[PDB]
């Protein structure tokens, strides 16, 4: 059903895109519990919806800090896109609202924690393990790209593991709906396509370059381009000569040579055959793409569970009180949120 869904999906997304849901909950409806992660101008907390008992992950963003770091349009992008999309491997936005000081996005909670945690701990994933995850990302990008959405921040830190061991892509902070090309220098250094670094203008093909980095990092335990400083990483990316671990299969290597491809006219995902150049690659020969979509494949790794509200798969973070000023801040800037 990786065809029938896409058709109905565009019509549904466009309606929500053009008429976004707004102000669908209030802060006092949630018991805040624990910080699950942190960002440039906020944090994500585990919360319990008191009325239903459900647990959620609440993203809290300081309006003033968003403005100061000129992320207003990016933040409006994030919420407008998240409220409009629907796909098995995307976190759900359940509620959103704002108060005098903050913006709130209440999302689905992924008890399995971040892929990043597991990947660093174990060192690296086997190729079948990496393939299982990578298949979900390919399907997700097929979906997003069908909607003229670019994602622009793929990395293990932004991929949650759910109770069944399947991926939930989170963190739509740099997502953008764009027909044609765009120019913002954004993303994470290790994952940036050369087009981005060279400020040439770029398109959805940067996400497929990022898929190449992700698969490399999953199977190797380290990314293809690393250094101590971003500029040194950028220098390696633009030079662009990837070298593979000796344990990489010939098939994996061929796939990565076609994803980590500087030439847009040759990069898989960006040819006339689109995503099927990837789906049909020999490395994915064993993958049942429909089974993956239907979540009927046995996950390689099911996280250690516990009664909802358990956060064993998360790092501990310094807790801070959520202050709400008696005066409204940046109201005009975030009018449509």
């Amino acid at each position: 059903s990786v065809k029938e869904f896409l058709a109905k999906a565009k019509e549904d997304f466009l309606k929500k895109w053009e008429n976004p849901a707004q102000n669908t909950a209030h802060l006092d409806q949630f018991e805040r519990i624990k910080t699950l992660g942190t960002g440039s101008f906020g944090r994500v907390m585990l919360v319990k919806h008191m009325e239903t008992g459900n647990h959620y992950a609440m993203k809290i963003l300081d309006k003033q800090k968003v403005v100061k770091l000129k992320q207003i349009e990016h933040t409006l992008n994030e919420k407008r896109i998240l409220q409009a999309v629907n796909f098995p491997f995307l976190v759900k936005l359940e509620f959103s609202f704002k108060d005098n000081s903050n913006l709130y996005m209440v999302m689905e909670y992924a008890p399995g924690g971040e892929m990043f945690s597991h990947l660093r701990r174990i060192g690296r994933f086997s190729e079948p393990h990496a393939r299982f995850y990578a298949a979900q990302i390919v399907l997700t990008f097929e979906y997003l790209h069908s909607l003229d959405l670019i994602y622009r921040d793929l990395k293990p830190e932004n991929l949650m593991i759910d109770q069944q061991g399947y991926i939930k892509v989170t963190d739509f902070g740099f997502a953008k709906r764009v027909k044609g090309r765009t120019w913002t220098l954004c993303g994470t250094p290790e994952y940036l396509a050369p087009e981005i670094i060279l400020s040439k203008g770029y398109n959805k093909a940067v996400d497929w370059w990022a898929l190449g980095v992700l698969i490399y990092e999953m199977a190797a335990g380290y990314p293809p381009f690393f250094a101590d400083q971003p500029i040194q990483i950028y220098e390696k990316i633009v030079s662009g000569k990837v070298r593979f671990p000796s344990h990489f299969s010939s098939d994996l290597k061929d796939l990565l040579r076609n994803l980590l491809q500087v030439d847009l006219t040759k990069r898989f995902g960006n040819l006339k055959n689109g995503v099927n150049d990837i789906k049909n690659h020999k490395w994915f020969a064993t993958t049942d793409w429909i089974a993956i979509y239907q979540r009927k494949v046995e996950a390689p790794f099911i996280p250690k569970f516990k009664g909802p509200g358990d956060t064993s798969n998360f790092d501990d973070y310094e807790e801070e009180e959520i202050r709400v000023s008696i005066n409204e801040k940046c109201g005009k800037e975030f009018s449509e949120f």
Binding site: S40, L69, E157, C186, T188, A220, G221, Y222, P245
Partner: peptide
Amino acid sequence: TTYADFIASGRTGRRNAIHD
């Protein structure tokens, strides 16, 4: 080894985005 070089680097923890 490349792995040992990665582990000795300053970028084995969570990586910050850039913007823009």
